[PDB]
Structure 1
Amino acid sequence: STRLKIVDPYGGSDDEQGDNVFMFKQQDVIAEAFAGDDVVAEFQEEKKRVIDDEDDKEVDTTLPGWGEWAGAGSKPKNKKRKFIKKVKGVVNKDKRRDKNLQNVIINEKVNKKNLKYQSSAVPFPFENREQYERSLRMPIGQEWTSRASHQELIKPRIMTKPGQVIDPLKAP
């Protein structure tokens, strides 16, 4: 707890050595915290601001004076649905990972610098991303695999004899 114990010559008039320490330790004056800012509200506000900076940000930049006598009175008959185009926002609202989790705000703006470490399109043999990830899912260096499995995972597909003539096959 706090305050606990100093017995100097100048300090600790009372609170002497209690070697019995039974039936005389029932104070237990527990200090309490405070209601500092109620940071759940601040966190929900920051989460709501990031969610508002999401969801494709769709804009009603309508034609503001085109055709229908805008400005200074004269509220005409037509309802202004002229330009309801939607910019391509970063993530939709129901495809983030913050809708499930509580008190967790992740933000999925994509990195222009880590454009550089992925292939733009899929490779030729492995026909989609599932087969390509399942291809390179396992490493081959000796820090992650055993010695015999490592010497099996590396060898060329055409292991040639080192210094003599390679004849054409004639088996059957």
Structure 2
Amino acid sequence: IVQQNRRADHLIFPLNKPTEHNHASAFTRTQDVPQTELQEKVDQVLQESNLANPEKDSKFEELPEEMRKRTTEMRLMRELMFREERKARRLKKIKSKTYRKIVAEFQEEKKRVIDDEDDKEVDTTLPGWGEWAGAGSKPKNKKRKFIKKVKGVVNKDKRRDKNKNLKYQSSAVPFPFENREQYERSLRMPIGQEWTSRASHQELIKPRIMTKPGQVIDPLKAPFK
């Protein structure tokens, strides 16, 4: 039970079920001892002559041509039978029947922004060191010596044109996620009133731990551990 309580989306902290007593009805007696003079009079008469209706169950628990001809005594017994008698009669008919059956220019600005991109191929290859620079007297070849790569903002074959607020975005990926695809799939839907329906807004904003505001929280008890 500890695992399902850890995995449950919502814990409603009246969690041990309160022992609900039988409701105060107006169809019965909420004390089961005679409470008025009328009640004790009626019960002493009714215990002089009891009316638990076991006799009135066995009297009406007795009743082809029984189906066709008896269309008057059937209605008479239907009017005559009491509550549990009619329940048993319905059960007997149910069991009997169930036993019976079964734009050319636009390219210059595009070309300029391509040039202000794409890995920024600088060369400071060596200005004059080692090899007698300046005023004639050429050196040897392989003046390759410095082609370092300051990284452009986007590489040339990874745009889509070929086919102050870095404090409003988080520094790294936070703990429970493993990549920013997962984490932004968490952030992708707004829980606001303006963007969801009312039912979806309520489902999105109800908290996990929901306690009652003025009653004691008892420790958990399980069905035999």
Question: Normalising to structure 2: TM-score of the pair?
Answer: 0.50
Partner residue in 2 for 1:104: none
Partner residue in 2 for 1:43: 106
Could you list the per-position Cα deviations for residues 52-88 of structure 1 after superposition, in whole angstroms to 9, with x for gaps in the alignment? Answer: 1111211111212211112222223233111111212
Show the 5 A alignment for 1:111-126: 113-126=164-177
Counterpart pick for 1:141 among 184, 192, 211: 192
Specify the SS of the correspondent of 1:55. Answer: coil
Counterpart pick for 1:82 among 139, 142, 145: 145
1:126 is displaced (CA, Å) by: 2.4
Higher helix share goes to which structure?
Answer: 2
Q: Which structure is larger by alpha-carbon Rg, 1 or 2?
A: 2
Determine the C-alpha separation between the residues in 1 that align with 2:140 and 2:176: 61
Could you list the per-position Cα deviations for residues 2-39 of structure 1 after superposition, in whole angstroms to 9, with x for gaps in the alignment? Answer: xxxxxxxxxxxxxxxxxxxxxxxxxxxxxxxxxxxxxx
Which letter maps to 2:182? Q
1:73 equivalenced with 2:73 (yes/no): no
Which letter maps to 2:130? G
* Percentage of identical aligned residues: 100
Equivalent pairs, count: 121
Return closer, same or farther for 1:77/1:152 CA change in 2, 3 Å cut-off.
Answer: closer
Counterpart pick for 1:165 among 216, 219, 224: 216
Gaps of 5+ in 2: 1-102
Question: Normalising to structure 1: TM-score of the pair?
Answer: 0.64
Partner residue in 2 for 1:55: 118
Moved over 6 A (4+): none
Q: What is the Cα-based RMSD across aligned positions, in Å? A: 1.5
